[PDB]
Design a protein around this nucleic acid. Sequence first.
DNA 1: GGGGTGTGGTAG
DNA 2: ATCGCTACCACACCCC
Length: 438
Amino acid sequence: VACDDPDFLTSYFAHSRLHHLSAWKANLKDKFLNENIHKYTKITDKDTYIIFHIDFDCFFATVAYLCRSSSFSACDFKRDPIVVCHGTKNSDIASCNYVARSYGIKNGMWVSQAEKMLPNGIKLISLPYTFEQFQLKSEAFYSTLKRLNIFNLILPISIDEAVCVRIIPDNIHNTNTLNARLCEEIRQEIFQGTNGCTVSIGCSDSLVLAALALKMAKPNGYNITFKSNLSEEFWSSFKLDDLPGVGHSTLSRLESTFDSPHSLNDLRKRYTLDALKASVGSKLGMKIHLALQGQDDEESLKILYDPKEVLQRKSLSIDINWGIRFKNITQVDLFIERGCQYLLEKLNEINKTTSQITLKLMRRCKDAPIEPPKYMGMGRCDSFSRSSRLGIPTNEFGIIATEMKSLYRTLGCPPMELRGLALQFNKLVDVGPDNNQL
DNA sequence: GGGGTGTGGTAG
DNA sequence: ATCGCTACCACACCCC
Ligand SMILES: Nc1ccn([C@H]2C[C@H](O)[C@@H](COP(=O)(O)OP(=O)(O)OP(=O)(O)O)O2)c(=O)n1
Ligand SMILES: [Ca+2]
Ligand SMILES: [Ca+2]
Ligand SMILES: [Ca+2]
């Protein structure tokens, strides 16, 4: 299905695991809001809480293995390096098992890159996606978590991951013996309920330490590390980009500024708050500083104190940066129209209008090959964005699609140089019962 | 003090 | 072959 075919968006989203991830996450958040419309559902100043951060180990790889076709009968999850991917070369490894990771393979690597990490005779097993079973195993996960009746708040993070909060009465002497019991119950009940998937669990009294504890626990384990338990041994165990919020760009800046720390212990012994803030910015610097103390920042805590506002959707968009090869502006405009139709179907499902929209595009870099290394990839591009305030909030196709096509024209991208498009509704407006307006 | 725009970055 | 999405904080830099 080419990008000028009316079925392209349907086919692309059907095959895109990144689309599936975002849609699943959005749907879990909507369900949380719907199930909690009447309930208080939030941590109070008065609560002392424990965080149980629970997450499937190598989720797609595990499920796709447990569900593999007869052709993969013989595959051994504990001995073979297994990846889930569409392709054979410049195709993303969506998930890899811990055997593969023992050779240095990582989620997001191209199969082409991963294969070079393997010694002679060691063969990469590549399993197809099983999207519907990913969903079904997630359902079993979330159902088990609720049925245990041990959590005061269950927060969806993604298809395979939840932050679960237990409030501890001041009446009650929490102990790690009780926490280990709960961890082991959760792991067993989910292993049973999912027919063979494993989860790991990080357990702490901050979100950030629960996240690091989760990392330490993997694969197929649990780790309890409270602030009281912090030690050089703990911090020495983590790379810099194990901290939530530290990706590759922030890592690069930390390594430049602090002489290539090789563990969170190195960073914590070397940094100063002000140098940190200079390196990575004021809020991120404060976040990292607080994290290196085992403590959450104000922004991260909002999910505990006001989950309904955190989880409420504030924008709606689609992004298509793969398979984009148009010959003329007629075809670009029709695709923009198809994208607007899709977005408006979603906007109407949530009973909202929009007052502000954006078109963003990827354009081939002047010196970048027409056909990039990744088949149908966007390749190396320059990004361009323009937004427009609509005035009266609307859900009218005619208004929105017209302004989107106009936004496209102002960015000046020749159709044959286009490599990607995003269509965004940046501001959403409730629809109430009263619609009488002059 | 309040508003605005486009862009960087991260996560899963 | 191959399916490189998408929500949202923070930021720089503009206005008054
Ligand atoms: N670069 C990525 C990262 C994740 N995912 C999908 C596949 C993962 O199975 C799943 C969940 O993401 P996680 O980051 O939780 O990773 P895994 O569950 O695969 O491994 P881990 O045991 O490290 O949590 O999301 C993907 O397609 N591409
Ligand atoms: Ca996981
Ligand atoms: Ca996860
Ligand atoms: Ca990180």
